[PDB]
Amino acid sequence: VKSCKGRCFERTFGNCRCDAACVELGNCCLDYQETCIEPEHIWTCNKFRCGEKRLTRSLCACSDDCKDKGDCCINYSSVCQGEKSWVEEPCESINEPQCPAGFETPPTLLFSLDGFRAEYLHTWGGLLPVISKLKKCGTYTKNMRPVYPTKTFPNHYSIVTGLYPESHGIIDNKMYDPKMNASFSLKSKEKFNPEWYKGEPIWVTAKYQGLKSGTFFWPGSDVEINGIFPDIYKMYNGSVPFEERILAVLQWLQLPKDERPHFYTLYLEEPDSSGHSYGPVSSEVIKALQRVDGMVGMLMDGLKELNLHRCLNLILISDHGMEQGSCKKYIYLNKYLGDVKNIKVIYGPAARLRPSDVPDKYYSFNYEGIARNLSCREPNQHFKPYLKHFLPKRLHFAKSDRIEPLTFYLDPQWQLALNPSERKYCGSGFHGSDNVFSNMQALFVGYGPGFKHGIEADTFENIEVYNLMCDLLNLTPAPNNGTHGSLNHLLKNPVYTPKHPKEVHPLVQCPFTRNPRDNLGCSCNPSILPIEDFQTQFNLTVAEEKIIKHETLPYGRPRVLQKENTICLLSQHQFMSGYSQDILMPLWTSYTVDRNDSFSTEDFSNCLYQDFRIPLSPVHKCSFYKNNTKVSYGFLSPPQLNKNSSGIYSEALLTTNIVPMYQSFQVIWRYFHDTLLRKYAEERNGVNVVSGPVFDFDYDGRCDSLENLRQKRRVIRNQEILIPTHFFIVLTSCKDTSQTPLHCENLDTLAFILPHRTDNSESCVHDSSWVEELLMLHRARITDVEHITGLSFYQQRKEPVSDILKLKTHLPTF
Ligand SMILES: *[C@@H]1O[C@H](CO)[C@@H](O[C@@H]2O[C@H](CO)[C@@H](O[C@@H]3O[C@H](CO)[C@@H](O)[C@H](O)[C@@H]3O)[C@H](O)[C@H]2NC(C)=O)[C@H](O)[C@H]1NC(C)=O
Ligand SMILES: *[C@@H]1O[C@H](CO)[C@@H](O[C@@H]2O[C@H](CO)[C@@H](O[C@H]3O[C@H](CO)[C@@H](O)[C@H](O)[C@@H]3O)[C@H](O)[C@H]2NC(C)=O)[C@H](O)[C@H]1NC(C)=O
Ligand SMILES: *[C@@H]1O[C@H](CO)[C@@H](O)[C@H](O)[C@H]1NC(C)=O
Ligand SMILES: *[C@@H]1O[C@H](CO)[C@@H](O)[C@H](O)[C@H]1NC(C)=O
Ligand SMILES: *[C@@H]1O[C@H](CO)[C@@H](O)[C@H](O)[C@H]1NC(C)=O
């Protein structure tokens, strides 16, 4: 016979050898390698191995006795008995789980493919049959938004805590904490120091509530967090073959019920490693993608053999995407600063700057000096210096002391360093950029009894996944930055029903009080028809008010969730508002721009009308602002918008509809209300607008207390004034343009948190087309606005709460 089957390593008579010497003599049987050697180095059966005489040094068996001795290769039944593999079976729905005793609550496995950009599945899906089937049979989104910076430790730790890096403390793999005077490195023993890891990873949450955990690698799983390790964890060793990681998890799923985990993790270094080395569009990445596709297949086949393929909930995920770097698209700061030796620059697309003399000069150092030094130096400059607190609030990258006070925002494909010596190869693949860039977006597929089948969900953020995993494991989540219930649409049977938050103190009233018509110091433009009988013009019939309320608060009035705060509803013909006596300012106005409404070019500067519903105050007078070089004022509900006349809406000039405003910000505000709002109103057939001030002096993304606000007032012309840190805008139309904002089945929303700064250095003015770009950069989720104002919107919409949460957590795209 001319085959080695049955005779591996036996000396033979029959002119065809099966011993190691044959190779040198070139007289091996044609199947010698496949039959006798390959089995020492592979985890697969194949037509050469089916019914093999058992070899002692094989990793797994394809011998006839393999099912009895329980060590068949995972693909044994597919290849050697002609059964179908998991990927070959058509989708079938999992309406009831089929689990062994112990899994009354089914297990969840969090499977991470490092650096798997969402685009890889968009484009190479036809080369990835297993992940493609998981998508087809499961719950998929085209894009999961990672956290900023779009790096590995921060995103993995974010996924298992539901926290932004600014709150969980792992902002990068290399950090300096000044209050600890220590440095974090993965090569150091500081990696194991629990001082670094804030929040509560899901394996900790689980342990407190009775469930055990098995992590085969994950950031934090090798650290004693709140005094807890996972019940099973592995010391990181990237050289462990992917197959052995998957086989280990399959061994864990066969432990007896008393010691068998409910929560599992699996981490693979591909395709991040190949992406860095060869670029995201490369033969090496295609091969890496096909390899990880096969490892997912190996898991699914393994689960089928254990009859757990209709039991386990699989979350297939990645931390971040991958971009093509270029030596032509790297910025070196030494060009503008020279070979200075006193600063450390964290290089890459998420570049940060710090003094070398730490912790001594960390707070005293002249950040603003370098910030101004590096601003608007070139035309079409590809980087932008920001003091952390001036970065867009959507990035939630400021609160932590481990975030260097000076950061850089870089354009897509662009990185930054001090000089070419202090960086790795410029032409490599890279990640770290803004978390809304296409190529940074991440993988998400959910498959199992808990998840819906054949569903394509809209973009959601990875900070939402912790709550989802808690629901899948019947866990009460630790407090986190996800909006519990926003991902209920992914689940067959949601376990948490969200409720709209309750107003703590009921709305105070601001009654009309007869008082003297005073001089406010105004040189009003003649065209404006004043309010000559206030009490006449503002004594409204219930019918008249119902009409006004229906037109201006179609979604309900914003509700205040702040504890010690007293607001009152002020009514007008074209807008409503919530006024704060404590801060002498409205917290919010609400109005509606209709398609065919008039915007006036008529000047309305130095013109205010007194509101008799509140006490007159110095800071409500035109005179307080007349030739004032510290602060000016602006209107929330815009006087340029008339429904009745073609002139100026006089009621909009009330003292109660003004906010402190820097003259530089007036350009942005004036351009928005004169030009943009008109274009938006036409494009969307009407726009409901809610605008207001924001006080975030703590730069923690949260509305500050009344108590803390008292101490942040500035003294200008011997008066106490509170100057907003930001202004928020929330635009609301219908998805269907045919209908107007008052009659929408489905809301289309767009929100901004615009920074309130004394100059427009951020936009490098040198055509106001830059105002559009600044609005886009400072876009926010309605949830972001809610958190930073203490307000809660759309509480009167007839939609279920979970659907409203989905809408509020949405970030807009352009
Ligand atoms: C993201 O979610 C986390 C947790 O839900 C939020 O972080 C937490 O922020 C609160 C308020 O700043 C912190 O509480 C406080 O502790 C200090 C120090 O003892 C105390 O003086 C205060 O009175 C208050 O009780 C809490 O420590 C903190 N937790 C963590 C893990 O950082 C964060 O606010 C959320 N971020 C956003 C933007 O919603
Ligand atoms: C990290 O994981 C590595 C890959 O899984 C692993 O490397 C391997 O270690 C085995 C034994 O632990 C080596 O095998 C040699 O030792 C056996 C045992 O007696 C001897 O019979 C043989 O001489 C055999 O050569 C493998 O050579 C080695 N595999 C690879 C690919 O390197 C390490 O143990 C793990 N730990 C660290 C931190 O590196
Ligand atoms: C801080 O660490 C530095 C070295 O990193 C050390 O020389 C110094 O003694 C430490 N303590 C302080 C508070 O400066
Ligand atoms: C910025 O400061 C550096 C020193 O770090 C200096 O070389 C350069 O002249 C300054 N650039 C200016 C004033 O824009
Ligand atoms: C005050 O008036 C002076 C004189 O024209 C002018 O230079 C200055 O800009 C004015 N300041 C403000 C902010 O109105």
Author numbering: 105 to 870, 874 to 921
What does the paper say about this structure?
We have determined the apo structure as well as several structures co-crystallized with natural products, natural product analogues and small-molecule inhibitors. The apo structure has only a single Zn atom in both the A and B protomers. Additional zinc was added to the gel-filtration protocol as we found that one of the two Zn atoms in the active site was either missing or not fully occupied. Asn277 adopts two distinct conformations, whereas Leu290 has a single conformer that moves slightly to accommodate bound compounds.
Ectonucleotide pyrophosphatase/phosphodiesterase 1 (ENPP1) is an emerging therapeutic target in human cancers owing to its role in degrading cyclic GMP-AMP (cGAMP), an agonist of the stimulator of interferon genes (STING). Ectonucleotide pyrophosphatase/phosphodiesterase 1 (ENPP1), also known as PC-1, is found as a secreted protein in the extracellular matrix and as a membrane-bound protein intracellularly and on the cell surface. ENPP1 has a role in purin­ergic signalling through the hydrolysis of nucleotide triphosphates (NTPs) and cyclic nucleotides (cNMPs) to their corresponding nucleotide monophosphates (NMPs). Apart from viral poxins, ENPP1 is the only known hydrolase of cyclic GMP-AMP (cGAMP), which is a second messenger generated by cyclic GMP-AMP synthase (cGAS) as an innate immune-system response to double-stranded DNA in the cytosol.
